[PDB]
Design a protein around this motif. Structure first.
Motif, short mmCIF file in Angstrom:
data_model
loop_
_atom_site.label_atom_id
_atom_site.label_comp_id
_atom_site.label_asym_id
_atom_site.label_seq_id
_atom_site.Cartn_x
_atom_site.Cartn_y
_atom_site.Cartn_z
N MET A 1 0.78 -1.18 -0.15
CA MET A 1 0.13 -0.11 -0.03
C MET A 1 0.96 1.19 0.00
SD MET A 1 -3.24 1.19 -0.08
CE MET A 1 -2.36 1.49 -1.47
N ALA B 1 2.58 6.90 1.50
CA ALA B 1 3.31 8.10 1.68
C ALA B 1 3.83 8.44 0.14
CB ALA B 1 4.67 7.76 2.35
N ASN C 1 6.91 10.69 -1.95
CA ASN C 1 7.87 11.46 -1.73
C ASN C 1 7.92 12.39 -2.82
OD1 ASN C 1 9.77 10.25 0.17
ND2 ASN C 1 9.30 8.12 -1.25
N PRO D 1 8.38 16.49 6.32
CA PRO D 1 10.03 16.86 6.59
C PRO D 1 10.75 16.59 5.19
CG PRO D 1 8.91 15.06 7.93
CD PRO D 1 7.80 15.09 6.86
N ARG E 1 19.10 14.06 -0.55
CA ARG E 1 19.63 12.61 -0.82
C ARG E 1 21.10 12.97 -1.16
NH1 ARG E 1 15.39 9.90 -5.16
NH2 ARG E 1 13.96 9.20 -3.66
N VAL F 1 14.06 15.97 -1.00
CA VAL F 1 12.74 15.19 -1.04
C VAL F 1 11.92 15.35 0.37
CG1 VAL F 1 11.77 13.10 -1.33
CG2 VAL F 1 13.98 13.66 -2.36
N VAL G 1 3.43 11.30 4.38
CA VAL G 1 3.09 10.13 5.12
C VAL G 1 1.73 10.15 5.51
CG1 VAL G 1 3.76 8.27 6.80
CG2 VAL G 1 5.33 9.30 5.62
N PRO H 1 -2.55 0.68 8.57
CA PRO H 1 -1.92 1.44 7.25
C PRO H 1 -1.61 0.49 5.90
CG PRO H 1 -0.07 1.62 8.70
CD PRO H 1 -1.18 1.09 9.60
N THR H 2 -1.29 -0.86 6.17
CA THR H 2 -1.21 -1.39 5.16
C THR H 2 -1.58 -2.78 5.20
OG1 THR H 2 1.02 -1.48 5.98
CG2 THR H 2 0.98 -0.81 3.66
N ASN I 1 11.07 12.68 11.03
CA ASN I 1 9.78 12.34 10.82
C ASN I 1 8.91 12.70 12.20
OD1 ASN I 1 9.54 11.83 7.89
ND2 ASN I 1 10.92 10.21 8.52
N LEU J 1 7.63 0.48 13.04
CA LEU J 1 7.53 -0.52 12.22
C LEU J 1 6.35 -0.12 11.21
CD1 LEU J 1 8.19 -3.44 11.68
CD2 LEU J 1 6.60 -4.02 13.49
N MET J 2 5.29 -0.12 11.76
CA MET J 2 4.08 0.15 10.69
C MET J 2 4.25 1.38 9.59
SD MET J 2 2.10 -2.21 10.87
CE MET J 2 3.42 -3.30 11.62
N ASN J 3 4.53 2.59 10.10
CA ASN J 3 4.70 3.60 9.17
C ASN J 3 5.90 4.07 8.62
OD1 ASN J 3 1.64 4.99 9.52
ND2 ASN J 3 2.53 4.54 11.54
N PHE J 4 7.21 3.84 9.43
CA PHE J 4 8.36 4.22 8.84
C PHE J 4 9.29 2.91 8.82
CE2 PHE J 4 7.88 8.70 8.78
CZ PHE J 4 6.67 8.64 9.70
N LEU J 5 8.90 1.76 8.44
CA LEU J 5 9.76 0.63 8.12
C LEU J 5 8.74 0.06 6.90
CD1 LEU J 5 11.86 0.68 9.69
CD2 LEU J 5 10.94 -1.16 11.25
N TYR J 6 7.49 -0.37 7.19
CA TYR J 6 6.69 -0.99 6.36
C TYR J 6 6.30 0.09 5.21
CZ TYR J 6 6.13 -5.55 7.99
OH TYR J 6 6.60 -6.92 8.20
N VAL J 7 5.46 1.01 5.49
CA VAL J 7 5.11 2.15 4.68
C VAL J 7 6.00 3.08 4.07
CG1 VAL J 7 3.14 3.85 4.18
CG2 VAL J 7 2.65 2.02 5.50
N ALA J 8 6.61 3.88 4.97
CA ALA J 8 7.44 4.63 4.48
C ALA J 8 8.88 4.45 4.80
CB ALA J 8 7.27 6.33 5.20
N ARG K 1 13.47 4.33 0.70
CA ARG K 1 12.71 4.84 -0.28
C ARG K 1 12.87 6.32 -0.42
NH1 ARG K 1 8.49 3.54 0.78
NH2 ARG K 1 8.23 1.37 1.48
N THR K 2 12.53 7.25 0.35
CA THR K 2 12.67 8.61 0.21
C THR K 2 14.00 9.08 0.18
OG1 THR K 2 12.80 9.81 2.42
CG2 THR K 2 10.86 8.39 2.15
N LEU K 3 14.89 8.30 0.75
CA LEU K 3 16.22 8.61 0.66
C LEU K 3 17.02 8.20 -0.60
CD1 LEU K 3 16.98 10.44 2.73
CD2 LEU K 3 17.44 8.52 4.30
#
Lengths: 520, 153
Positions: free
Chosen positions: A73, A76, A78, A127, A131, A137, A141, A175-176, B77, B138-145, B149-151
């Motif tokens: 899912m 978020a 970027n 935030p 990179r 970026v 979220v 969330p997923t 974050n 875990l949920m939002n900043f490992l799984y989802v974000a 990926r953003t880095l």
């Protein structure tokens, strides 16, 4: 990574069945599963969850159970920011960033810490990170205002009925994940769950890359409700399933199609050969028993040999190189199962690496492309066989190098080794078609390899009265220094000898060893 | 036909299996969440305490450089602070199961300071908020974000 739920109607005894089969790193720590059973006067739950979580994600009890699989899912986005004059261009002009001055301490090496200033910049999107190449970026979220994740799973797995279960699911606090469900009452369900930003335009691949951050044109603010998401309940087919494939063949007589949803929710890419086997193992079988259900989960087929050896082999037999010729006869003689004794399998993985990429996904190569109209049989054939044969040539060198011979028994190179337990392996890469997965590592200098990821917690439950359930944890129930419960179940997994899972007091009262009274 | 009679625990206790599996019986919810917390500290104590340490954003400070990127990722974050909010925002019934879970990890440590690793002792008094924060990470900043990926990295 694998999930199956079958309706009474498709079973021999008339009781729904569930498969909990998550696939994750065998080593990263936050991904470690642990199995437990909690009993209270008002509820009961058995299952596995990632260490540190106060609630069981893969759970079941006498009434129901659920399981998860990664759906990816996109929660978020970027944004690529257009920096200018100390702010970022946004819509017509330059907006200054929100700046917070934070700081953290850094352990030194001599035991001391030193203060490290950290400046957090935020655009209206979220935030800002720079990179390594300089792209600024901003991460936005979704769901950051959903405090109730743990309680949601909790009220979900302790639900008194499907109706109560879906109400909890409906709070959109998780969330997923694809989440599959099953009842002693008989309903089964598959939900493409998650918190997804409502968007006006954009294919999912658009939203997964750097969306432009110069316009409020792309700043979403709302998210979808549960009933806007792909979901299937008690389908005509009598089963639901998900092996990480996009959500378009969750049951076989399918109940919806990609046209029915926003294109940014899930991709529309080819399904894994493992995903394809998942649908075939379910749809093609009827009057299932817990036992056959459990036999089907062990499936380890080299589906990709079935899609290619027909064209590959005769092409290779006419190769001048006697060794390529001999490679093709070893391949032609293979029953195409990643079994421990197989002498052709390694050789084939090595060919597939070249023919289908280092991760075996990869459709160039096939003669007839994948199609949702024949979702379970289409990536098929070899496009340019001469090319494919030169690949088999290279692959023979590889296999020889990596394993010392082109015909080494699969299970002598592929080993499951925990502590001092070293047992033969079977099954393999999911993308080659094996349903039971063990993503083998690269080989050490003796050609021995072990699983980097794959089967971890595996349970199968029949919702009879009482419930009957069997399972196993690859890496045991503890990795604390010195336990006798780390290398504990691996040799069992090698033989697929599952332990009965015990939920009844009487069964617990009898298996007791180790015992601790507490009072809080 | 109704399912089989639910068992009514009459005292709190954990009956452990031959494979190291705990059957946690509690006279009430909070007790069960404490027994559960104890169980986990017993079976995966060291990594859970390391994980919670990182979720407070204290990785760089407790263990150094190798943990700095997760720290910068989690502070930027604002995960540790949001975890404090999510904890205050829980319903009372549940906040108590969470505090009960944290209290069990703690009780296990205090009663078994040896059966527990040196680098993570400094983390030790853990809290319902630490629990909420790791889950949030875990949920939002490992799984989802995820940071890769953003880095891009």
């Amino acid at each position: 990574s694998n999930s199956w739920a079958v309706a009474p109607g498709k079973t021999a005894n008339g009781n729904a069945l569930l498969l909990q089969n998550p696939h994750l790193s065998w080593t990263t720590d936050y991904f470690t599963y642990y199995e437990a059973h909690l009993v209270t006067p008002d509820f009961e739950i058995y299952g596995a969850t990632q260490i540190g979580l106060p609630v069981i994600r893969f759970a079941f009890n006498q009434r129901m159970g659920i399981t998860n699989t990664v759906n990816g899912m996109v929660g978020a986005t970027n944004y690529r920011l257009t920096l200018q004059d100390g702010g970022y261009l946004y819509d017509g002009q330059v907006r200054p960033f929100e700046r917070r001055q934070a700081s953290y301490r850094l352990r030194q090496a001599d035991g001391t810490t030193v203060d490290k200033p950290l400046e957090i910049r935020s655009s209206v999107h979220g935030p800002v990170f720079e990179r390594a190449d300089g792209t600024a970026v901003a991460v936005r979220v979704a769901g950051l205002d959903r405090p109730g994740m743990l309680e949601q799973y909790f009220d979900m797995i302790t639900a008194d009925s499907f109706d109560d279960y879906e109400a909890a699911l409906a709070r959109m606090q998780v969330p997923t994940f694809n989440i599959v469900y099953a009842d002693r009452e008989g309903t089964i369900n598959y939900s493409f769950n998650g918190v997804a930003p409502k968007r006006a335009e954009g294919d999912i691949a658009f939203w997964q890359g750097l969306v432009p951050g110069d316009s409020s044109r792309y700043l979403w603010t709302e998210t979808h409700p549960l009933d806007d998401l792909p979901r299937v309940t008690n389908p005509p087919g009598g089963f639901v399933q998900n092996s990480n494939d996009p959500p378009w063949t969750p049951t076989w007589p399918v109940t919806y199609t990609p046209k029915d949803f926003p294109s940014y929710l899930a991709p529309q890419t080819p399904h894994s050969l493992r995903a394809q086997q998942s649908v075939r193992l379910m749809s093609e079988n009827d009057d299932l028993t817990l036992e056959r259900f459990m036999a089907l989960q062990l499936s380890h087929r080299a589906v990709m040999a079935d899609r290619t050896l027909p064209d590959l082999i005769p092409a290779a037999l006419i190769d001048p190189d006697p060794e390529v010729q001999a490679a093709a006869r070893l391949l032609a003689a293979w029953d195409r199962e990643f079994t421990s004794d197989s002498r052709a399998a390694l050789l084939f993985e090595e060919w597939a690496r070249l023919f289908a990429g280092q991760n075996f996904a990869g459709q160039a190569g096939f003669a007839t492309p994948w199609s949702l109209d024949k979702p379970v049989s289409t990536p098929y054939g070899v496009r340019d066989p001469k090319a494919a044969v030169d690949q088999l040539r290279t692959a023979i060198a590889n296999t020889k190098r990596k394993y010392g011979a082109i015909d080494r028994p699969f299970g002598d190179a592929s080993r499951m080794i925990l502590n001092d337990v070293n047992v033969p392996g079977a099954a393999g890469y999911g993308n080659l078609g094996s349903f039971r997965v063990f993503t083998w590592s690269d080989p050490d200098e003796n050609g021995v390899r072990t699983p980097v990821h794959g089967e971890t917690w595996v349970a199968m439950i029949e919702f009879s009265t009482p419930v009957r359930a069997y399972g196993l944890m690859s890496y045991g129930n503890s990795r604390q220094p010195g336990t006798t419960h780390y290398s504990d179940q691996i040799e069992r997994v090698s033989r697929a000898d599952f332990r009965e899972l015990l939920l009844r007091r009487e069964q617990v009262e009898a298996a007791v060893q180790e015992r601790t009274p507490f009072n809080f | 036909q109704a399912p089989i009679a639910a068992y009514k625990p009459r005292s709190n206790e954990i009956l452990w299996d031959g494979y190291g599996v705990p059957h946690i019986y509690g006279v009430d919810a909070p007790s069960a969440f404490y027994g559960y917390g104890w169980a986990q500290a017993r079976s995966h104590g060291d990594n859970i305490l390391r994980l919670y340490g990182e979720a407070r954003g204290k990785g760089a400070e407790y263990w150094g450089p190798d943990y700095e990127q997760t720290t910068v990722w989690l502070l930027t974050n604002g995960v540790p602070e949001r975890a404090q909010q999510w904890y205050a925002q829980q319903s009372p019934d549940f906040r108590a199961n969470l505090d009960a879970f944290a209290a069990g990890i703690n009780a296990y440590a205090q009663q078994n300071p040896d059966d527990i690793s040196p680098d993570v002792r400094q983390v030790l008094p853990v809290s319902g908020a630490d629990v909420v924060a790791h889950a949030h990470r875990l949920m939002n900043f490992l799984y989802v974000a995820s940071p890769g990926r953003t880095l891009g990295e």
